[PDB]
Coordinates of all heavy atoms in Angstrom, one line a residue:
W172 N 2.5 -48.3 111.5 CA 2.4 -47.2 110.5 C 3.7 -46.4 110.4 O 4.3 -46.1 111.5 CB 1.2 -46.3 110.8 CG -0.1 -47.0 110.7 CD1 -0.9 -47.1 109.5 CD2 -0.8 -47.7 111.7 NE1 -2.0 -47.8 109.8 CE2 -2.0 -48.2 111.1 CE3 -0.5 -48.0 113.0 CZ2 -3.0 -48.9 111.9 CZ3 -1.5 -48.7 113.8 CH2 -2.7 -49.1 113.2
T173 N 4.0 -46.0 109.2 CA 5.2 -45.1 109.0 C 4.9 -43.6 109.4 O 5.8 -42.9 109.8 CB 5.6 -45.1 107.5 OG1 4.5 -44.7 106.7 CG2 6.0 -46.4 107.0
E174 N 3.6 -43.3 109.3 CA 3.1 -42.0 109.6 C 3.6 -41.4 110.9 O 3.5 -42.1 112.0 CB 1.7 -41.7 109.3 CG 1.2 -42.0 107.9 CD 0.8 -43.4 107.6 OE1 1.2 -44.4 108.3 OE2 0.1 -43.5 106.6
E175 N 4.0 -40.2 110.9 CA 4.3 -39.4 112.0 C 3.4 -38.1 111.9 O 3.0 -37.7 110.7 CB 5.7 -39.1 112.2 CG 6.6 -40.4 112.0 CD 8.0 -40.2 112.4 OE1 8.4 -39.0 112.6 OE2 8.6 -41.3 112.5
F176 N 3.0 -37.5 113.0 CA 2.1 -36.4 113.0 C 2.8 -35.3 113.9 O 3.3 -35.6 115.0 CB 0.8 -36.8 113.6 CG 0.1 -37.8 112.8 CD1 0.3 -39.2 113.1 CD2 -0.8 -37.5 111.8 CE1 -0.4 -40.2 112.3 CE2 -1.5 -38.4 111.0 CZ -1.2 -39.8 111.2
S177 N 2.8 -34.1 113.3 CA 3.4 -33.0 114.1 C 2.4 -31.9 114.2 O 1.6 -31.7 113.2 CB 4.8 -32.6 113.6 OG 5.9 -33.3 114.3
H178 N 2.3 -31.3 115.3 CA 1.5 -30.1 115.6 C 2.4 -29.0 116.2 O 3.1 -29.2 117.2 CB 0.3 -30.4 116.5 CG -0.7 -29.2 116.6 ND1 -1.0 -28.4 115.5 CD2 -1.4 -28.8 117.7 CE1 -1.9 -27.5 115.9 NE2 -2.1 -27.7 117.2
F179 N 2.4 -27.8 115.5 CA 3.4 -26.9 116.0 C 2.9 -25.8 116.9 O 3.6 -24.9 117.3 CB 4.2 -26.3 114.8 CG 5.0 -27.3 114.1 CD1 4.5 -28.0 113.1 CD2 6.3 -27.5 114.5 CE1 5.2 -29.0 112.4 CE2 7.1 -28.4 113.9 CZ 6.6 -29.2 112.8
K180 N 1.6 -26.0 117.4 CA 0.9 -25.1 118.3 C 0.5 -25.8 119.5 O -0.5 -25.5 120.2 CB -0.4 -24.6 117.6 CG -0.1 -23.7 116.4 CD -1.2 -22.6 116.3 CE -2.4 -23.1 115.5 NZ -3.6 -22.3 115.9
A181 N 1.1 -26.9 119.7 CA 0.8 -27.7 120.9 C 1.2 -27.0 122.2 O 2.1 -26.1 122.2 CB 1.4 -29.1 120.8
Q182 N 0.5 -27.3 123.3 CA 0.9 -26.8 124.6 C 0.8 -27.9 125.6 O -0.1 -28.8 125.4 CB 0.0 -25.6 125.0 CG 0.4 -24.3 124.2 CD 1.7 -23.7 124.6 OE1 2.4 -23.1 123.8 NE2 2.2 -24.1 125.8
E183 N 1.6 -27.8 126.6 CA 1.5 -28.8 127.7 C 0.1 -28.8 128.2 O -0.6 -27.8 128.3 CB 2.5 -28.4 128.8 CG 2.6 -29.4 129.9 CD 3.9 -29.4 130.6 OE1 4.4 -28.2 130.8 OE2 4.5 -30.5 131.0
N184 N -0.4 -30.1 128.5 CA -1.7 -30.4 129.0 C -2.8 -30.4 128.0 O -3.9 -30.6 128.3 CB -2.1 -29.7 130.3 CG -1.1 -30.1 131.4 OD1 -0.8 -31.3 131.5 ND2 -0.6 -29.1 132.1
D185 N -2.4 -30.2 126.7 CA -3.4 -30.4 125.7 C -3.7 -31.9 125.7 O -2.8 -32.8 126.1 CB -2.7 -30.2 124.3 CG -2.6 -28.7 123.9 OD1 -3.3 -27.8 124.6 OD2 -1.9 -28.4 123.0
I186 N -4.9 -32.2 125.2 CA -5.3 -33.6 125.2 C -5.0 -34.2 123.9 O -5.6 -33.8 122.9 CB -6.8 -33.7 125.6 CG1 -7.0 -33.2 127.0 CG2 -7.2 -35.2 125.5 CD1 -6.1 -33.8 128.0
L187 N -4.1 -35.1 123.9 CA -3.7 -36.0 122.7 C -4.8 -37.1 122.7 O -5.0 -37.8 123.7 CB -2.3 -36.6 122.8 CG -2.0 -37.7 121.8 CD1 -1.8 -37.1 120.4 CD2 -0.7 -38.5 122.2
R188 N -5.6 -37.2 121.6 CA -6.6 -38.2 121.5 C -6.3 -39.0 120.2 O -6.1 -38.5 119.1 CB -8.0 -37.5 121.4 CG -9.1 -38.4 121.0 CD -10.3 -37.6 120.7 NE -11.4 -38.4 120.3 CZ -12.3 -38.9 121.1 NH1 -12.2 -38.6 122.4 NH2 -13.4 -39.6 120.6
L189 N -6.3 -40.3 120.4 CA -6.0 -41.3 119.4 C -7.2 -42.2 119.2 O -7.7 -42.7 120.2 CB -4.7 -42.1 119.8 CG -3.5 -41.3 120.0 CD1 -2.2 -42.2 120.2 CD2 -3.1 -40.4 118.8
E190 N -7.6 -42.3 118.0 CA -8.7 -43.3 117.8 C -8.2 -44.3 116.8 O -7.6 -43.9 115.7 CB -10.0 -42.6 117.3 CG -10.4 -41.5 118.1 CD -11.6 -40.7 117.5 OE1 -12.0 -41.1 116.4 OE2 -12.0 -39.7 118.1
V191 N -8.4 -45.6 117.1 CA -8.1 -46.7 116.2 C -9.4 -47.1 115.5 O -10.4 -47.4 116.2 CB -7.4 -47.8 116.9 CG1 -7.3 -49.0 115.9 CG2 -6.1 -47.3 117.5
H192 N -9.4 -47.1 114.2 CA -10.6 -47.5 113.4 C -10.4 -48.6 112.5 O -9.3 -48.9 112.0 CB -11.2 -46.3 112.6 CG -11.7 -45.2 113.4 ND1 -13.0 -44.9 113.6 CD2 -11.0 -44.2 114.0 CE1 -13.1 -43.8 114.3 NE2 -11.9 -43.4 114.6
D193 N -11.5 -49.3 112.1 CA -11.4 -50.4 111.2 C -12.2 -49.9 110.0 O -13.4 -49.6 110.1 CB -12.1 -51.6 111.9 CG -12.1 -52.8 111.0 OD1 -11.6 -52.8 109.8 OD2 -12.5 -53.9 111.6
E194 N -11.5 -49.8 108.9 CA -12.1 -49.2 107.7 C -13.0 -50.2 107.0 O -12.7 -51.4 106.8 CB -11.1 -48.7 106.7 CG -11.8 -48.1 105.4 CD -10.8 -47.9 104.3 OE1 -10.2 -48.9 103.8 OE2 -10.5 -46.7 104.0
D195 N -14.2 -49.8 106.6 CA -15.1 -50.6 105.8 C -15.8 -49.7 104.8 O -15.7 -48.5 104.8 CB -16.1 -51.4 106.6 CG -16.5 -52.6 105.9 OD1 -16.1 -52.8 104.7 OD2 -17.2 -53.4 106.5
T196 N -16.4 -50.4 103.8 CA -17.0 -49.7 102.6 C -17.9 -48.5 103.0 O -17.7 -47.4 102.4 CB -17.8 -50.6 101.7 OG1 -16.9 -51.7 101.3 CG2 -18.2 -49.8 100.5
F197 N -18.8 -48.8 103.9 CA -19.8 -47.8 104.2 C -19.7 -47.0 105.5 O -20.0 -45.8 105.6 CB -21.2 -48.4 104.1 CG -21.4 -49.1 102.8 CD1 -21.3 -50.5 102.8 CD2 -21.7 -48.5 101.6 CE1 -21.5 -51.2 101.6 CE2 -21.9 -49.2 100.4 CZ -21.8 -50.6 100.4
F198 N -19.2 -47.8 106.5 CA -19.1 -47.2 107.9 C -17.7 -47.8 108.4 O -17.4 -48.9 108.2 CB -20.1 -47.8 108.8 CG -21.5 -47.6 108.2 CD1 -22.2 -48.7 107.7 CD2 -22.0 -46.4 108.2 CE1 -23.4 -48.5 107.1 CE2 -23.3 -46.2 107.7 CZ -24.0 -47.2 107.1
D199 N -17.0 -46.9 109.0 CA -15.8 -47.3 109.7 C -16.2 -47.7 111.2 O -17.1 -47.1 111.8 CB -14.7 -46.3 109.6 CG -14.2 -46.2 108.2 OD1 -14.5 -47.0 107.4 OD2 -13.5 -45.2 107.9
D200 N -15.5 -48.6 111.8 CA -15.8 -49.1 113.1 C -14.8 -48.6 114.1 O -13.6 -48.8 113.9 CB -15.9 -50.6 113.1 CG -16.3 -51.2 114.5 OD1 -16.9 -50.5 115.3 OD2 -16.0 -52.4 114.7
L201 N -15.2 -47.9 115.1 CA -14.3 -47.3 116.1 C -13.8 -48.5 117.0 O -14.6 -49.2 117.6 CB -15.0 -46.2 116.9 CG -14.3 -45.8 118.2 CD1 -12.9 -45.2 117.9 CD2 -15.1 -44.8 119.0
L202 N -12.5 -48.7 117.1 CA -12.0 -49.9 117.8 C -11.6 -49.5 119.2 O -11.6 -50.3 120.2 CB -10.8 -50.5 117.0 CG -11.2 -51.1 115.7 CD1 -10.1 -51.8 115.0 CD2 -12.5 -51.9 115.8
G203 N -11.2 -48.2 119.4 CA -10.8 -47.8 120.7 C -10.4 -46.4 120.7 O -10.0 -45.9 119.7
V204 N -10.5 -45.8 121.9 CA -10.1 -44.3 122.0 C -9.1 -44.2 123.2 O -9.3 -44.7 124.3 CB -11.3 -43.4 122.1 CG1 -10.9 -42.0 122.6 CG2 -12.0 -43.3 120.8
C205 N -8.1 -43.4 123.0 CA -7.3 -43.0 124.1 C -7.0 -41.5 124.2 O -6.8 -40.8 123.1 CB -6.0 -43.8 124.3 SG -6.5 -45.5 124.5
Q206 N -7.1 -41.0 125.4 CA -6.9 -39.6 125.7 C -5.8 -39.5 126.8 O -5.8 -40.2 127.8 CB -8.2 -39.1 126.3 CG -9.3 -39.0 125.2 CD -10.5 -38.1 125.7 OE1 -10.8 -37.1 125.1 NE2 -11.1 -38.5 126.8
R207 N -5.0 -38.5 126.6 CA -3.8 -38.3 127.4 C -3.4 -36.8 127.4 O -3.3 -36.2 126.4 CB -2.7 -39.2 126.9 CG -1.4 -38.9 127.5 CD -0.4 -39.9 127.1 NE -0.9 -41.3 127.4 CZ -1.0 -41.8 128.6 NH1 -0.7 -41.1 129.7 NH2 -1.4 -43.1 128.8
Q208 N -3.1 -36.3 128.6 CA -2.6 -34.9 128.7 C -1.1 -35.0 128.3 O -0.4 -35.8 128.9 CB -2.8 -34.3 130.0 CG -4.0 -33.4 130.1 CD -4.3 -32.9 131.6 OE1 -3.8 -33.6 132.5 NE2 -5.0 -31.9 131.7
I209 N -0.7 -34.2 127.4 CA 0.7 -34.3 127.0 C 1.6 -33.4 127.9 O 1.3 -32.4 128.3 CB 0.9 -33.9 125.5 CG1 0.4 -32.4 125.3 CG2 0.1 -34.8 124.6 CD1 0.7 -31.8 124.0
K210 N 2.8 -34.0 128.1 CA 3.8 -33.5 129.0 C 5.1 -33.3 128.3 O 5.4 -34.1 127.3 CB 4.0 -34.4 130.2 CG 2.7 -34.8 130.8 CD 2.1 -33.7 131.6 CE 0.7 -34.0 131.9 NZ 0.2 -33.6 133.2
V211 N 5.9 -32.2 128.6 CA 7.1 -32.0 127.9 C 8.0 -33.3 128.0 O 7.9 -34.1 129.0 CB 7.9 -30.8 128.6 CG1 9.2 -30.5 127.8 CG2 7.0 -29.6 128.6
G212 N 8.8 -33.5 127.0 CA 9.7 -34.7 126.9 C 9.2 -35.8 126.0 O 8.3 -35.6 125.2
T213 N 9.9 -36.9 126.1 CA 9.6 -38.0 125.2 C 9.0 -39.2 126.0 O 9.5 -39.5 127.1 CB 10.9 -38.5 124.4 OG1 11.2 -37.4 123.5 CG2 10.6 -39.7 123.6
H214 N 7.9 -39.7 125.5 CA 7.1 -40.7 126.3 C 6.6 -41.8 125.5 O 6.3 -41.7 124.3 CB 5.8 -40.0 126.9 CG 6.1 -38.7 127.6 ND1 6.6 -38.8 129.0 CD2 6.3 -37.4 127.3 CE1 6.9 -37.6 129.4 NE2 6.7 -36.7 128.4

């Protein structure tokens, strides 16, 4: 994806959560979830 996401009220140790979904007409299907505490720097 070309999309980037920025949050300007973030703080260290906030939980970045990413969900990957599969879109369908009536219900989307959750494909996986990841959770991570964010740390200063580039990762």
Side-chain angles (χ1 to χ4, degrees):
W172 295 271
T173 53
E174 300 88 341
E175 315 191 344
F176 300 87
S177 268
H178 186 39
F179 293 89
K180 294 214 273 159
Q182 284 293 151
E183 187 156 37
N184 298 316
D185 281 344
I186 297 312
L187 168 73
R188 168 193 182 91
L189 300 185
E190 308 172 3
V191 174
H192 297 254
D193 183 355
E194 174 193 70
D195 206 355
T196 304
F197 310 100
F198 307 105
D199 296 343
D200 182 20
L201 167 62
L202 296 187
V204 166
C205 299
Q206 290 196 120
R207 169 170 306 290
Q208 262 171 343
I209 59 169
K210 308 288 164 144
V211 185
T213 292
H214 304 280

